[PDB]
Design a protein around this ligand. Structure first.
Ligand SMILES: CO[C@H]1C[C@@H]2CC[C@@H](C)[C@](O)(O2)C(=O)C(=O)N2CCCC[C@H]2C(=O)O[C@H]([C@H](C)C[C@@H]2CC[C@@H](O)[C@H](OC)C2)CC(=O)[C@H](C)/C=C(/C)[C@@H](O)[C@@H](OC)C(=O)[C@H](C)C[C@H](C)/C=C/C=C/C=C/1C
Lengths: 1050, 317
């Protein structure tokens, strides 16, 4: 069907007919793709209202609810239809409502023909099963053939109800035997069809288990156990699980198994049926459908009760929930203290952890209902603290506690700022803030002690506090102590934000910082060698001072490693920039400065350190040669500069800049003369390096043996660009090559922090079962800063930029690469100068007159076959969406076709150039962007036909959900480097304090997370916000204004 | 060219502003407007000089003297000047720019810059002048309609449809109505208050018409107060009657076939003195003379290789 799908859908592109739409979701169905079908439906609906089933549609869509509403709409208008009846019935039998099904069958027994009757009997059996009328079941049993599996199956059902054993066993074995050859036929269907009859064998072996349970009183616990495990074991939607369980119910009543029906009900509610789970709660509690609502809830089964409680929360009324919760906790501490005899310490502990979940939900709900003010702070403090008492090991509890202290600190600081906007104030503020500060630190730290591998939010909190308020004595106490308790691994994670603050003026902080970085220096130094070598070279002196201090502290053990680190790093910064380019940019800059801006001072300033670099002397061959050719003219122009220093005569200056212009237009002819570099010429020292103990950049993680550089490849390929990067490659101790982009004049810190963020989000999706289910991920690369200008980027194998491959299809099929652009300017020469309307008309001209089929068509040709084709297309879709969402959250602007690239094999996509962050993109002056990220019609068409509402949008939902869920941590990581000392520069470039603007940023982010981004008043659910977002990245008005090299039309 | 009873102007992307005689179809004269397309075309009330609003400049060519180059150029404005308008005394000029500014220029002064400046947040899409000459109605992309008082300096903004961009706004000679048109395709019409003398001029909501599916480019009243026209991206210009606000006439350039090209847009319209006919400017490089009542095509002048974005029609005695 991979192949059949292609012809099907292009046949669809010829034209969109319902006959195609029915042949669509089908091939969707047995190619098993669930969501894409949902797409077929979606488009079919937004355009064609012909219907002619919406019911078979919803049914094969596994949505029964809308299917029923549709089927009644179809049946009431029409006559009585044997088929429509059957369909309307399937909706109910999957729904799990027997009460309607039995009636609906017996209400008309006349209209059932021998074809419709046999089909009727089967479902009907299932109907009569639920009510507990075994006679209806039995009569409608004998209608169903003994040849089909379900017949001899229900036969066994009856035999076990009537306690006929031998009969039941024979029937079970035969029942297997009939369905046997069926499963043989899966063969593409793996976690797929096997599920399908995993149901059948499920029920069968379950029946073995029944005939065991009723036959003897031992195994009860063990049955309850396998049930338990494989309840947890193979997870399914509610609707199949009703049958799944009711099978099990054939012997055991709900009250023995109660845990089962409990987390089952949890599946129901967490799947969006409150009513069903409600009924289940009545059946289990023993009582209490809502009739008398004034009566507190039965404590008979504390578990069940509590379950029922958070169940009520998820409904509309939270207040009764709150009250009954308090009455229940207060009832339970009294059932605890007095009714305890020393004989059960088992009841005690579980009842207590129960009390913990209770206190926690108490606090959270106080939060939801009220919001933060003076009154709720100590209340939630107390509930949370009690939760901390009753269960000492709970990470949830300690985390909520510490988070709450932190949030109180923030509430009082923000309240203080709100008082400053309009002497005792600052003192009461100090005491209060400290008071809520220290337990924050404590709780955060202990909560971390129990984490073991996700500390991240909590750790960035620890550092936010540490850096803000840390020079207070009590807080310093808590800090050093928590430092004592904790394992040292935790801060590897936080190493970059650490080293950003090493220059901190507050002494008490700089102290514990150097101390900690030294302890971490002891074990696994490989982590701290690179960044601290980067900082070992800095303009602000304090940084490199305190740095060399700790380099010293490392030497006593690690000296060889340290020296090789510094050495290789230096050599790297050198190779990154050869002197001739240094002078190229230095002189272009200086000349621009003095002649353009009439600035002599700036010219001297940028000129001089270059001359210092000329002074220390070439240690290498290429530099020696440059010195040879241009050195005289350079030193001469320098002497003319000193002559302007002494004389004041401008002609001495024009004379210097004569030599300068000379060596410059001598160089510029050699600039794209380097497509390559040889290491013997450029850096003999690196050519020398053999079997170092230094780990390959970014390759280090605590859980695996060290991969280190064996050698460095002699040749480096320099990529042609404005920045002119180099292709570096290294050979390690493991035997594999490792490739690194060498980039001059680029700041890798932004992208470094961003990569940390994406590592986190990767973990987040690793936590969500739906995302884990769908392989949702963001491709990530190891980033290794060297200097502020220079750096190392991990190259991504098998990857081509969009623009590149576009160009490929342009020259291959021989359509002009720029042809659209050329037609734009053709009809409209002024195009960038046009009004919005003109712009748009132009754009539409361009689009109607061009096919966006490039990406998808080539990708079709890109794949070796249809199947892999499909796979790739899907992985694309998915990844695309992932970074679509995580990207709009981070606010990534300015992605031109080149600005991302496709993996060819896996197909998946990578984004780069994260130097543009947040809302900076749209706030820029010339050509501001109206776009969250590019939905442009080639990317659009690249997916399955009208792939908007298919895997794409549905996944938009998924990711967005995950984000709104984990949101606190994301805010932590964002606010971590939004306010970071060194990187605050990018927030001031909107010109062409910073506190205020950064807070604006984080406010708008929290807006994005809460759904406050679009309209401030409304709170948008995931689906609608996704709707308006996709409507924004769509509208031609937004897409037309765009920078023409950004390629909106591609 | 300025001595003919009917001045009909046409401009576009082909770098020419062409003057026609409306009763023939024969091109009277052609003026070169280089390096910029024309956003707006308007003839001054005294018919002495014609003004063209382009990109970062406003170029004014002489109608009275035949075949000159421009008399008056106004620069210093960044990005577009989209809309223009004139005072009945010929001294003052009003220009909506994309600078987010509605400006008042002194024509009889040599000053390169502007005499008055009203800046909003959003780019201003339209500028039109209330008959009493005391106020300026300014539409923008934010969806805000600013009433700018030229005496009190007081400004009052009105947002009928939020966040959707209003494109054009105009006001009828009798000052009994005000109509505005947007990107949505809706056309809103308000009643005016006769408190003009004391500087009140309140706006009272009357009708909202789902005029077009697609964008609506311009809406302009006939001098009769009888007819309100709206041009749109749908390749249609619809003439409505002020009484019922029901559809009277519909002008359609549609291909007469589902599969052709979107043959281009009807950008602007100007009513003739007697409101018997209506002039059109289209993306097909044609200016067309239509019968308002019948709907027939009375005349067609192609002057251009490239598109036509503009119209100027003047009958004055
Ligand atoms: C300067 O010119 C000489 C110095 C000599 C000393 C003796 C004379 C014979 C002059 O004084 O030039 C001179 O006659 C002169 O100024 N000229 C040259 C002939 C055209 C008229 C005039 C001129 O326009 O210069 C211009 C005049 C000074 C005023 C400019 C107005 C603004 C802005 O364009 C300039 O700021 C830079 C200043 C400057 C130029 O055109 C120079 C010739 C060439 C450029 C390519 C620049 O535009 C520059 O623009 C960013 C750059 O591209 C950056 C720097 C990098 C490249 C490698 C520049 C290389 C130029 C090296 C030239 C130098 C050392």
């Amino acid at each position: 069907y991979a192949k059949a799908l292609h012809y099907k859908e292009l046949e669809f592109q010829k034209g969109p007919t319902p006959a195609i739409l029915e042949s669509l979701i089908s091939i969707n169905n047995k190619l098993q793709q669930p969501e894409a079908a949902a797409g077929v439906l979606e488009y079919a609906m937004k355009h064609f209202g012909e219907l002619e089933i919406q019911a078979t549609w919803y049914e094969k869509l596994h949505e029964w609810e809308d299917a029923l509403v549709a089927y009644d709409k179809k049946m009431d208008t029409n006559k009585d239809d044997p088929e429509l009846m059957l369909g309307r019935m399937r909706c109910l039998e999957a729904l799990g409502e027997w009460g309607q099904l039995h009636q609906q069958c017996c209400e008309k027994w006349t209209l059932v023909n021998d074809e419709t009757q046999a089909k009727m009997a089967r479902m009907a059996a299932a109907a009569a099963w639920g009510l507990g009328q075994w006679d209806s079941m039995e009569e409608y049993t004998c209608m169903i053939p003994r040849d089909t599996h379900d017949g001899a199956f229900y036969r066994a059902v009856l035999a076990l109800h009537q306690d006929l054993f031998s009969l039941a066993q024979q029937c079970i074995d035969k029942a297997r035997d009939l369905l046997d050859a069926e499963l043989t036929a899966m063969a593409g269907e793996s976690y797929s069809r096997a599920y399908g009859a995993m149901v059948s064998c499920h029920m069968l072996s379950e029946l073995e288990e029944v005939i065991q349970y009723k036959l003897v009183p031992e195994r009860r616990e063990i049955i309850r156990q396998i049930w338990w495990e494989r309840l947890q074991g193979c997870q399914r939607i509610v609707e199949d699980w009703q049958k799944i369980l009711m099978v099990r119910s054939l012997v055991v009543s709900p009250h023995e198994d109660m845990r089962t029906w409990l987390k089952y009900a949890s599946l129901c509610g967490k799947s969006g049926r409150l009513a069903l789970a409600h009924k289940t709660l009545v059946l289990l509690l023993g009582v209490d459908p809502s009739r008398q609502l004034d009566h507190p809830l039965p404590t008979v089964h504390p578990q069940v009760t509590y379950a029922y409680m958070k169940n009520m929360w998820k409904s509309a009324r939270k207040i009764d929930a709150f009250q009954h919760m308090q009455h229940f906790v207060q009832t339970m501490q009294q059932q605890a203290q007095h009714a305890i005899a020393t004989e059960d310490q088992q009841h005690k502990q579980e009842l207590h952890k129960l009390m913990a979940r209770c206190f926690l939900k108490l606090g959270e709900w106080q939060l939801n209902l009220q919001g933060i003010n003076e009154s709720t702070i100590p209340k939630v403090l107390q509930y949370y603290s009690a939760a901390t008492e009753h269960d000492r090991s709970w990470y949830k509890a300690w985390h909520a506690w510490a988070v709450m202290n932190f949030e109180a600190v923030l509430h009082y600081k923000h309240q203080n700022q709100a008082r400053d906007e309009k002497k005792k104030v600052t003192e009461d503020l100090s005491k209060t803030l400290l008071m809520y500060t220290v337990p924050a630190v404590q709780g955060f730290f202990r909560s971390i002690s129990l984490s073991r591998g996700n500390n991240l939010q909590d750790t960035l909190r620890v550092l936010t506090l540490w850096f803000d308020y840390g020079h207070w004595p009590d807080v310093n106490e808590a800090l050093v102590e928590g430092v004592k308790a904790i394992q040292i691994d935790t801060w590897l994670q936080v190493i970059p934000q650490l080293i950003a603050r090493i220059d901190t003026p507050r002494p008490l902080v700089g102290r514990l910082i150097h101390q900690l970085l030294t302890d971490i220096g002891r074990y696994h130094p490989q982590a701290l060698i690179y960044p601290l070598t980067v900082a070992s070279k800095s303009t602000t002196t304090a940084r490199h001072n305190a740095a060399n201090k700790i380099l010293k502290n490392m030497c006593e053990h690690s000296n060889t490693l340290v020296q090789q680190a510094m050495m290789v790093s230096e050599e790297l910064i050198r190779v990154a920039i050869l002197w001739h380019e240094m002078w190229h940019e230095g002189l272009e800059e200086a000349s621009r400065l003095y002649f353009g801006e009439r600035n002599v001072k700036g010219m001297f300033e940028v000129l001089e350190p270059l001359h210092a670099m000329m002074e220390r002397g070439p240690q290498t061959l290429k530099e020696t040669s440059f010195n040879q050719a241009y050195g005289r003219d350079l030193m001469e122009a320098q002497e003319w500069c000193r002559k302007y220093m002494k004389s004041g005569n401008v002609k001495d200056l024009t004379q210097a800049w004569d030599l300068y212009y000379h060596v410059f237009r001598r160089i510029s002819k050699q600039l794209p003369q380097l497509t390559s570099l040889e290491l013997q010429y450029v850096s003999p020292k690196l050519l020398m390096c053999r079997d170092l103990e230094l780990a390959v950049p970014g390759t280090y993680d605590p859980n695996q043996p060290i991969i280190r550089i064996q050698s460095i490849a002699p040749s480096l390929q320099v990529i042609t660009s404005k920045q002119r990067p180099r292709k570096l490659t290294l050979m390690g101790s493991n035997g594999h090559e490792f490739v690194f982009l060498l980039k001059g004049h680029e700041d890798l810190r932004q992208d470094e922090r961003v990569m940390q963020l994406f590592g986190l989000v990767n973990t987040l999706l690793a936590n969500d079962p739906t995302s884990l289910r769908k392989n949702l991920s963001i491709q990530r690369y190891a980033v290794i800063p060297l200097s502020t200008n220079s750096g190392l980027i991990g190259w991504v194998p098998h990857c081509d930029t969009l623009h590149a491959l576009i160009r490929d299809y342009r020259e291959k099929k021989k359509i002009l690469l720029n042809i659209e652009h050329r037609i734009m300017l053709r009809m409209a020469p002024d195009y960038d100068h046009l009004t919005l309307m003109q712009k748009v008309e132009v754009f539409e001209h361009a689009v109607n007159n061009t096919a966006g089929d490039d990406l998808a068509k080539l990708l079709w040709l890109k794949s070796p076959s249809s199947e892999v084709w499909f796979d790739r297309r899907t992985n694309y879709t998915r990844s695309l969406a992932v970074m679509s969402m995580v990207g709009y959250i981070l606010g990534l602007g300015d992605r031109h076709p080149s600005n991302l690239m496709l993996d060819r094999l896996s197909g998946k996509i990578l984004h780069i150039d994260f130097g543009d962050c947040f809302e900076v993109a749209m706030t820029r002056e010339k050509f501001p962007e109206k776009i969250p990220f590019r939905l442009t019609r080639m990317l659009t068409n690249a997916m399955e036909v009208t792939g908007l509402d298919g895997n794409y949008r549905i996944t938009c939902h998924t990711v967005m959900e995950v984000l709104r869920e984990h949101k606190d941590s994301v805010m932590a990581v964002l606010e971590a480097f939004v306010y970071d000392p060194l990187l605050n520069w990018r927030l001031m470039d909107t010109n062409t304090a910073l506190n205020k603007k950064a807070i604006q940023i984080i406010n708008r982010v929290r807006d994005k997370l809460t759904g406050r981004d679009f309209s401030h008043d409304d709170t948008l659910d995931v689906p609608t916000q996704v709707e308006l977002l996709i409507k924004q990245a769509t509208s031609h008005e937004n897409l037309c204004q765009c920078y023409i090299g950004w390629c909106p039309f591609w | 060219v300025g001595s003919d009873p009917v001045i009909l102007a046409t401009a576009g992307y082909d770098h020419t502003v062409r003057f026609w005689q409306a009763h023939s179809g024969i091109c009277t004269r052609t003026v070169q407007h280089q390096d910029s397309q024309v956003n707006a075309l308007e003839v001054t009330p005294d018919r002495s000089m014609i003004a063209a609003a382009g990109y970062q400049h406003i170029r004014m060519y002489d109608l009275n003297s035949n075949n000159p180059n421009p008399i008056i150029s106004y620069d210093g404005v960044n990005k577009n000047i989209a809309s223009v308008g004139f005072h009945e005394d010929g001294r003052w000029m009003y220009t909506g720019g994309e600078d987010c500014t509605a400006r008042i220029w002194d024509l009889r002064s040599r000053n390169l810059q502007c005499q008055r400046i009203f800046q909003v947040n959003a780019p201003i899409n339209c500028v039109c002048l209330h008959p009493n000459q005391a106020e300026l109605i300014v539409g923008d992309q934010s969806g805000a309609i600013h009433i700018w008082d030229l005496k009190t300096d007081h400004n009052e903004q009105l947002i009928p449809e939020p966040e959707v961009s209003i494109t054009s706004a105009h006001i009828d000679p009798d000052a009994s109505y005000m109509a505005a048109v947007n990107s949505t395709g809706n056309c809103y019409v308000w009643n005016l208050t006769g408190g003009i003398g004391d500087e009140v001029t309140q706006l009272i909501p009357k009708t909202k018409i789902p005029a077009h599916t697609r964008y609506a480019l311009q809406c302009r009243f006939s001098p009769d107060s009888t007819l309100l026209a709206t041009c749109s991206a749908d390749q249609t210009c619809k003439i409505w009657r002020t009484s019922n606000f029901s559809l009277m006439t519909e002008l359609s350039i549609k291909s007469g076939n589902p599969g052709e090209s979107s043959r281009g847009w009807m950008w602007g319209c100007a009513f003739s003195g007697d409101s018997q006919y209506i002039v059109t400017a289209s993306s097909d490089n044609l200016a067309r003379l239509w019968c308002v009542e019948t709907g027939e095509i009375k005349r067609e002048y192609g002057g251009h290789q490239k598109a036509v974005v503009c119209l100027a029609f003047n009958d004055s005695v």
